[PDB]
């Protein structure tokens, strides 16, 4: 899942978005705001992060650890022994969240609802191959 | 009769009068300076909502709520029942006010030049909202 | 300030013109190595106490290096809005914190080491701007350590 | 109790304005039927202080015009928020006709809270959920004074 | 020209005045069926001819009438580009040679009624650039009929 | 599938796209050019509109036939009987076309990939909702 | 927040229309008598705790108002740098420390004065934004009274 | 009552209207038009100033001076025995001139109105204006 | 006889309009009344011409009144300068009223003249002297017509 | 001292200035920033203030107190006996700083150096005679 060729598109595409985003704390907040609008129940698995207050340091320090994740991720997509330790690593972080696979497809979809707002060009598929690939890692 | 074409035209143009939430608050203070020039009488009938002072947080709030009003038939134009129960109640909240009948008529002048002064008069068509109009204030008058 | 703004602006700056649209997502591999071979150096740190024991062939290693890399970039990049800095700093204090010896000293020399690499690849380096604002990152993940 | 500030009620006028169907009722009944139906889901006993309105056949006309006046009146309060001398007016009017009715108290304000909280995201796009619920709670409280 | 590049302009932007962000998407209906009304009278045409018998309260017919301001909407849209214009028209006028009972002048009453509801419902219409553009359209679409 | 809360975004969110594209023309036709891009096998489905030449006015006209069908099914979403009606209809003029169910999946993540690159704010799951609506009418 | 930036601008926006070009420097004394004589009503504080009895023909307590507004008029357009307006907020609570009496109450009450004195000569204030950022004011001023 | 917050907001709102010595001749003629046109038999008394054509020289300085002395009423209306003194005068310049006494309720009608339409109607308060210039218009009538 | 230009004309309704307060009458009447003390102290005589507005006590309401009127008077004519038909009928209207008052001559207006021209840089900043002197000129000279 | 006349202008020229600065806290720090140059000895004398980091917000604090000062002294000029009241209160606050003559002198000069360079127009004289009126009250 997620060939060398859908990594070129995710890579290229994630650079232009995330990469070129002039308010990184505010790209990394929209995602878990769509996070939560997608997903309702998720936002309290949050409480530990100060979620109640998305503007706060605690929360936004929160979503810039996780799209600094994503984007190490992506980095190393090519890198297959590299990437799975990395994930694995991130497995056991995420072991005692007790997430299910809705939760995965919430994070899935509000990925893939930021991202091409702030493209030209966006390729669905290569994107929902290489997410499924960080997913299934974390979820271990 | 306020016909099909004639609800078509009266929406798109309230939605342009009414559409954005500021002025808003123009668009009722034409209205009431106009009928009260010519109906100063009526300014009585509001001294619980501050009519002498129509410029009051109390008078504007009313006129707010008479614009939202008048957004909810504008809007229900088209769902005769719905239009109908938005009337009903309208009409219970206008009964034992002593107003008297001639308001309404006033009114509906008042609102249509004060629509008609806001999308410019090129536009316009008197025919459309006097029709759409009076279906209106026919529901809610005695 | 130590680390004012516009040092902070400057760090920021010079760590996209390493990271920039060439070299972001192929180079942090290189760069952080480079960076644990000077740290290494500097601090007398055992290799051992990392994944993979500090072998650049590892990939437990490598993954490491990829997280102090991101980790870095997450928290250089936050250096304008130091609330979220703060907050950021204090979450790598209390990682390191379960960690049996990590010293001050030691986070200390890393963040000399992330400095002088940094300047290795950007000959133009504000090499002050770049003390002043690791020292500031350093002394947060380093408290009480 | 977080404050409704000037950049949150920038946020709400936003997506409330960007979601709103301006020409025609159809929108607003399925915001409110929406809101309804997880405020009757949550609290059971509520419905019974709609009979008035038909609330046993929410597809009604009857209902469905008592879904129009909701989301009128909140659309004139929203509207209200960059001027709260006129808005507090506007409370207190509100107040005083749930007042009016027998049996309606403040802890069904925070049902309705929920309901609003839910159905929003499903309406509106990049939806501000924390700015909602400051400004939200600034509109209900007003409602909610004296009951 | 008869349709102008400049009364293209000027159809397009009065029929975009009426389906505007505010009535977009929710009139298409009521401005479709007053169209046929106008049309059933010039044109002495058989509502029967028509999917749903030209009931309005058939969905059928709906159907029907939300595909033929649709169609309308594509030829309009596309007045300043004359050649994709003409190749909307060709396709339009194959589906109604196909049909038994679709005459040139009929063509002409339905694109004459589509002017006269636009004029309805937007008082400042132009309505010598409608003539134009509209005769242009019925030309395409009543070729050979 | 595609319920009233997840209309009202798709339609919101097709008037910003579509709604407002300067260019008409270069929209729909960018629909198509990532279609055959996404399944390269669909391309000689179009053989009959002058596809070997996609700037052509022949295949533009089909284009623009394509969106402004998807504007109207998209306008009376909220009309059961009437866009049952007219999905009926569009499934006779592809009755002979001998599509599967790729090429109607294709197809949707066209949409997909387009539409949001025109967009401030994107809903994945009600779009996908909704194209399957349109997508199942279709396929018959 | 509560009184956020925007709120703060606001407020400071208002004070600067009430305080304008034709009013600034002599309409203070006015402003601040009005200010007290509200005070004295919601508060119940004794006028007689006040240099010159709380009279205002008296120049000691007319030399009162015009700090007191004075302060106010600090305090406000501070209010954009939450640091400096903490600090001043501070040094003014040191001072009512010093004096008997003053309760956390009552600096709210002044407090609510001033903003409902501002509505009063500006119709169009922005109340909810006065109360928020007079209510940060107030706590400033009250701490631990 | 002309209160102290009255005053306040007058003079603030006097000084936005006529602060700025040109369009002090927009302020004057929105009084004027006004006031002739709910009083049309008032424009007799201004006979010798040439009333007809209210854009004439010898009208606009009238017009001018009414608005000068207007200027020093606000400008002294926390002095009263100085504003005293300032109506004593104009009471003398008023005198014997044949003017009925439902001219002056009118021209503070016509004045008000004109203020409210130059500095816009949200920041305006009826009641300060009315009391204050009621204050005025009590020293000069007789 | 130096004529007062557009240009003067400029410099002079700029210098009285940044020095103008608006809204209050004490700085109206602290410089008309530094005009009065330079008047009388340059000619004794002329204080008896106003007795009637008790120039005895100039810090008195009645004198603080006719402060008021002379500095409104003057303030009316300075705005009117880019009018002077208007002015014209300003000026004339003014000399009427001059005229009316036995003593007053041509000559006080020297004195007048030489009064403002010691004060207007005292409460002036940047004061374009040559621009008021035949500014002044040209207001004083028609109020002194006839006289 | 500080006639009337003098009041007008030193009214309108702080108006012009202070009552128009962009940055009041710039504007009040680059006063205690020009006193300090002028000399060096009265430094000191704030060290209960913060002023070892003239931009820390203590210290700032002082510098806007004091220009509040001046400008809630300088709208008293007209009313003898409250300014009269102000500045014997002020005097109270000055009291045990053991300030001299040189102290008062070189604040008169900061403030007459910074406040005309906000200025088209300045009366030297008249900001002397007033600047003598509050330093003298303040003095005591
Ligand atoms: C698949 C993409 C994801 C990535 C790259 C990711 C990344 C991260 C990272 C980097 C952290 C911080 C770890 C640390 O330093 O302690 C974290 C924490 C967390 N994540 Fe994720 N995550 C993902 C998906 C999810 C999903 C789908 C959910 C649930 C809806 C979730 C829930 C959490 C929670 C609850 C925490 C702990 C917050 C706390 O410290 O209280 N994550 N994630
Ligand atoms: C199409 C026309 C009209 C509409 C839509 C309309 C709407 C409204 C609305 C929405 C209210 C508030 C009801 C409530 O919540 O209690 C109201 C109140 C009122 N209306 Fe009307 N109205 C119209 C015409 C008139 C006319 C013609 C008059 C009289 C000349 C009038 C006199 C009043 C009065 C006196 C009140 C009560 C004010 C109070 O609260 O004391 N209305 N109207
Ligand atoms: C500026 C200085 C430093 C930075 C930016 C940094 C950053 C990081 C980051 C981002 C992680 C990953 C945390 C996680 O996701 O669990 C980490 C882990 C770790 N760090 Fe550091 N670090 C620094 C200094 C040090 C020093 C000086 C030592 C050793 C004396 C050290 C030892 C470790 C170890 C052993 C781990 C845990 C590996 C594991 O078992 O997962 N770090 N560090
Ligand atoms: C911010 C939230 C709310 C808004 C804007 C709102 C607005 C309105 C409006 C405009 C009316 C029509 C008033 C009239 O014509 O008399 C109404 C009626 C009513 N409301 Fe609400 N309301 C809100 C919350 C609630 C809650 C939480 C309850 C309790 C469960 C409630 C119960 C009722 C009832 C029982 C009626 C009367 C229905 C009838 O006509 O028979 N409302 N509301
Ligand atoms: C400007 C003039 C006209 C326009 C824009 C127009 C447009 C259309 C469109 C877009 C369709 C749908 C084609 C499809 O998808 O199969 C259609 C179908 C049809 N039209 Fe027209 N049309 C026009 C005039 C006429 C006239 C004058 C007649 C009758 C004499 C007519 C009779 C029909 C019929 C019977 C169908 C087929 C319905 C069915 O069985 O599917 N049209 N037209
Ligand atoms: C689900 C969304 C779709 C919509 C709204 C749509 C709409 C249309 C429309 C309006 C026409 C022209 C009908 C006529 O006037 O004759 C058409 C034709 C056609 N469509 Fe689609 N279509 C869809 C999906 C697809 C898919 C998924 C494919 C295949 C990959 C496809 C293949 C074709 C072909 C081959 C034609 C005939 C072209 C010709 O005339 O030679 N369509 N479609
Ligand atoms: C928002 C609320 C308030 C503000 C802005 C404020 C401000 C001030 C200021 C600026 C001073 C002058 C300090 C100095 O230079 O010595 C002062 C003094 C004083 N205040 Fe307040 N104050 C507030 C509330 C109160 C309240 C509620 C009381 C009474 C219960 C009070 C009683 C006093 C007294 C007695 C003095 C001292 C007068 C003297 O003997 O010098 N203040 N205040
Ligand atoms: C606040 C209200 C008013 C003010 C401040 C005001 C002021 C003035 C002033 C300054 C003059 C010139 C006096 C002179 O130098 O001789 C004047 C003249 C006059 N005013 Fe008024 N006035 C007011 C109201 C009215 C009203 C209500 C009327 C009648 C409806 C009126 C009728 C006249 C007439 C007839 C003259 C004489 C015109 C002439 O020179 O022939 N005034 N007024
Ligand atoms: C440009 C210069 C002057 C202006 C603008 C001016 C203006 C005025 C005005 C507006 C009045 C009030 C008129 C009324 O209500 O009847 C007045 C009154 C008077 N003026 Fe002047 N004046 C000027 C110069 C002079 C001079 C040079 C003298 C002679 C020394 C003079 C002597 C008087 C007297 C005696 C009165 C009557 C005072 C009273 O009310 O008892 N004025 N002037
Ligand atoms: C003549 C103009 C001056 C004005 C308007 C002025 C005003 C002020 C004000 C308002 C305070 C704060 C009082 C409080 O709330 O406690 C203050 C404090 C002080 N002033 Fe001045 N001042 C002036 C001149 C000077 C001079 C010439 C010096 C010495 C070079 C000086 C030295 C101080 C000191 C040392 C403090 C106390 C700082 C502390 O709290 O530690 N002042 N002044
Ligand atoms: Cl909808
Ligand atoms: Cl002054
Ligand atoms: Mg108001
Ligand atoms: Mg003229």
């Known amino acids: 899942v997620c060939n060398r060729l859908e990594q070129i598109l995710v890579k290229t595409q994630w650079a232009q978005s995330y990469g070129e985003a002039e308010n990184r704390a505010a790209f990394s907040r929209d995602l878990f705001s769509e996070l939560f609008n997608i997903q309702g129940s998720s936002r309290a698995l949050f409480s530990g992060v100060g979620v109640d207050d998305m503007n706060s340091a605690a929360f936004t320090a929160h979503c810039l650890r996780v799209t600094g994740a994503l984007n190490r991720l992506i980095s190393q997509l090519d890198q297959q022994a590299t990437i799975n330790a990395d994930l694995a690593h991130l497995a056991g972080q995420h072991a005692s969240r007790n997430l299910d696979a809705s939760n995965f497809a919430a994070m899935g979809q509000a990925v893939m609802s930021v991202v091409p707002t702030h493209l030209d060009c966006f390729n669905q598929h290569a994107w929902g191959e290489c997410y499924e690939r960080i997913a299934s890692g974390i979820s271990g | 009769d306020c016909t099909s074409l004639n609800r078509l035209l009266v929406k798109r143009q309230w939605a342009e009068a009414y559409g954005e939430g500021t002025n808003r608050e123009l668009l009722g203070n034409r209205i009431w300076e106009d009928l009260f020039a010519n109906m100063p009488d009526a300014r009585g009938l509001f001294s619980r909502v501050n009519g002498n002072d129509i410029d009051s947080s109390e008078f504007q709030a009313h006129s707010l709520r008479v614009l939202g009003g008048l957004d909810m038939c504008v809007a229900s134009l088209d769902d005769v029942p719905v239009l109908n129960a938005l009337l009903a109640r309208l009409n219970s909240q206008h009964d034992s006010r002593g107003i008297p009948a001639a308001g309404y008529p006033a009114f509906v002048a008042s609102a249509i030049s004060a629509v008609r002064a806001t999308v410019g008069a090129r536009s316009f068509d008197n025919d459309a909202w006097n029709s759409c109009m009076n279906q209106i204030v026919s529901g809610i008058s005695g | 300030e130590c680390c004012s703004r516009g040092d902070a602006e400057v760090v920021i700056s010079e760590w996209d013109q390493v990271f920039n649209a060439a070299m972001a997502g192929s180079s942090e591999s290189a760069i952080g190595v480079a960076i644990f071979d000077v740290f290494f150096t500097s601090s007398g740190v055992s290799p051992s106490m990392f994944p993979g024991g500090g072998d650049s062939s590892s990939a437990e290693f490598l993954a490491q290096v990829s997280r102090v890399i991101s980790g870095a970039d997450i928290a250089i990049n936050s250096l304008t809005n130091r609330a979220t800095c703060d907050s950021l700093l204090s979450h790598l204090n209390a990682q390191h914190k379960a960690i049996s010896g990590v010293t001050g000293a030691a986070v200390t020399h890393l963040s000399e080491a992330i400095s002088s690499v940094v300047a290795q690849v950007l000959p133009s380096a504000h090499i002050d701007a770049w003390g002043y604002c690791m020292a500031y990152i350093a002394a947060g993940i380093g408290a009480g350590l | 109790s977080s ?26 009944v399925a915001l409110a039927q929406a809101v309804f139906a997880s405020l009757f889901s949550r609290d059971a006993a509520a419905q019974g202080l709609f009979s008035g309105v038909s609330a046993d056949n929410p597809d009604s006309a ?46 069904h304000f925070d049902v309705m809270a929920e309901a609003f909280a839910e159905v929003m995201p499903q309406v509106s796009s990049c939806f501000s959920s924390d700015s909602w619920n400051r400004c939200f709670a600034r509109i209900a409280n007003g409602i909610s004074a004296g009951l």
Do not use: K, T
Request: hydrophobic share 45%; proline share 1%; glycine share 2%.
């Open chain 4, 3 to 28: 404050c409704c500030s000037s950049e949150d009620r920038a946020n709400v006028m936003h997506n409330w304005d960007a979601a709103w169907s301006a020409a025609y009722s159809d929108r607003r």
């Open chain 4, 62 to 107: 009857d209902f469905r015009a008592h879904c129009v006046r909701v989301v009128n009146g909140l659309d004139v309060a929203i509207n209200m928020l960059n001027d709260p001398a006129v808005l507090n007016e506007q409370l207190a009017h509100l107040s005083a006709q749930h007042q009016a009715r027998a049996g309606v108290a403040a802890a």
